[PDB]
């Protein structure tokens, strides 16, 4: 049981070369989803807003597959996120380094699937003027790879509805709508697409 | 495919001795450009201002070249910025350590050129008295190598115009002009020129 998981990890991690990331030849699809926990702080002097959310990331690597009958019927395991490649998904308009609120650990499944869900506090650019009214304020931040075009990393979402089932019920801010939408940009130059996921939150003082 | 890229990186990094930085006999030119995102806050009590920008840094190393044919037609790759030498480009008048907002990953092309774009938040010395006027305020900060004279690291810009096409449209502050200009400083005690890029931003509420 433990003996098998030790073999498994040793065969995937110590007796292999590290995955060098995706390429144009071997591209990778990353699935994104947001579970929005709280709008903590809105700063009207600087036009910054602070969110707390869970970012669900899912991808699949061939190099991480294993036959579960060779390893004691183990179907999945938990491992430090340092032991594996992780996509470089970034908020394009943060104003402070993102703060990580959760252990940096992933779940790997025998078909190569990786599920990695970091909890984060993000300050980003957003004008809260009018948040105290009935219409609210709308804010948006785009998430994407910092260095990979869509030829190497494709982003998708399973749903355009942000998960609000755990939004803090006594937040200073009530959520009016929260969507997460795949966006593709082309530039007049290059065949390669550029994908981001646009997180759009409309909120107001409760 | 992935095998080739692993080969290439092994050849360039593991089998290859550390590049020791430029030397007077092997000098290096770094191209700098700024993408201004936001003036985040001004502080009138301390004369500090906070910028958020992408700093494009591009340079070229002979020891990073490869023949694409020998590596499955690979023409470039992404790699962690720790895997390579990077230049020590520093703001000369910061008041806080820079905050890095983006992954530390660079793009390496088969001709040896490296493209590296850290997003940063910078606090630097700037007197915002008068931002709330129509003429606004002008501020400036020099970027350059901290330790290398112009005989080891030269600098340049592709354009004198800062990129404002990503400037946050609802920022508290609007930009009236933004330039990035190469300057030659003789500025200390040495008889050797140090090169900087002077970023000059005129802005107002």
């Amino acid at each position: 049981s433990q003996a098998n998981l030790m073999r498994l990890k040793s065969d995937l991690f110590n007796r292999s070369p590290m995955y060098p990331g995706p390429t144009k030849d071997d591209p990778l699809t990353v699935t994104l989803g947001f579970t929005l926990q709280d709008i903590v702080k809105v700063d009207s002097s600087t036009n910054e807003v602070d969110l707390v959310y869970y970012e669900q990331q899912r991808w699949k690597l061939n190099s991480l597959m294993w036959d579960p009958n060779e390893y004691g019927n183990i179907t999945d395991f938990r491992t430090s996120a340092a032991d594996i490649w992780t996509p470089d998904i970034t908020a394009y308009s943060s104003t402070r380094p993102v703060q990580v609120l959760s252990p940096q650990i992933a779940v790997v499944t025998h078909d190569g699937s990786v599920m990695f869900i970091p909890a984060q506090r993000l300050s980003f650019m957003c004008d809260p003027t009018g948040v105290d009214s009935e219409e609210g304020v709308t804010c948006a931040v785009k998430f994407g790879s910092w260095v990979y075009s869509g030829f190497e990393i494709d982003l998708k979402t399973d749903t355009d509805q942000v998960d609000l089932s755990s939004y803090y019920a006594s937040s200073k801010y009530e959520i009016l709508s929260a969507t997460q939408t795949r966006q593709v940009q082309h530039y007049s130059c290059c065949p390669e697409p550029y994908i981001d996921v646009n997180l759009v939150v409309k909120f107001r003082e409760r | 495919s992935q095998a080739n890229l692993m080969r290439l990186k092994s050849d360039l990094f593991n089998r290859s001795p550390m590049y020791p930085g430029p030397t007077k006999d092997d000098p290096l030119t770094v191209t700098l450009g700024f993408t201004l995102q936001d003036i985040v806050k001004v502080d009138s009590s301390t004369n500090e201002v906070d910028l958020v920008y992408y700093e494009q840094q591009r340079w070229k190393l002979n020891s990073l070249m490869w023949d694409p044919n020998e590596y499955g037609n690979i023409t470039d790759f992404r790699t962690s910025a720790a895997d390579i030498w990077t230049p020590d480009i520093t703001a000369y008048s910061s008041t806080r350590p820079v905050q890095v907002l983006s992954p530390q990953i660079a793009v390496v092309t088969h001709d040896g050129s490296v493209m590296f774009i850290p997003a940063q938040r910078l606090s630097f010395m700037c007197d915002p008295t008068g931002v709330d006027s129509e003429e606004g305020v002008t501020c400036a900060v020099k970027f350059g190598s901290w330790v290398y004279s112009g005989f080891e690291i030269d600098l340049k810009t592709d354009t004198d115009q800062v990129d404002l096409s990503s400037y946050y449209a609802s920022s508290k502050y609007e930009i009236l002009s933004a330039t990035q200009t190469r300057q030659v400083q003789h500025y200390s005690c040495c008889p050797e020129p140090y090169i900087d890029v002077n970023l000059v931003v005129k802005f107002r509420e």
Binding site: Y187, C189, Y194 | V107, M115, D163
Partner: peptide, 13 residues
């Protein structure tokens, strides 16, 4: 455009 995007930019200069 292109050369503002941290992912088109290796193709610009």
């Amino acid at each position: 455009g292109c050369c503002s995007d941290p992912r088109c930019r290796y193709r610009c200069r």
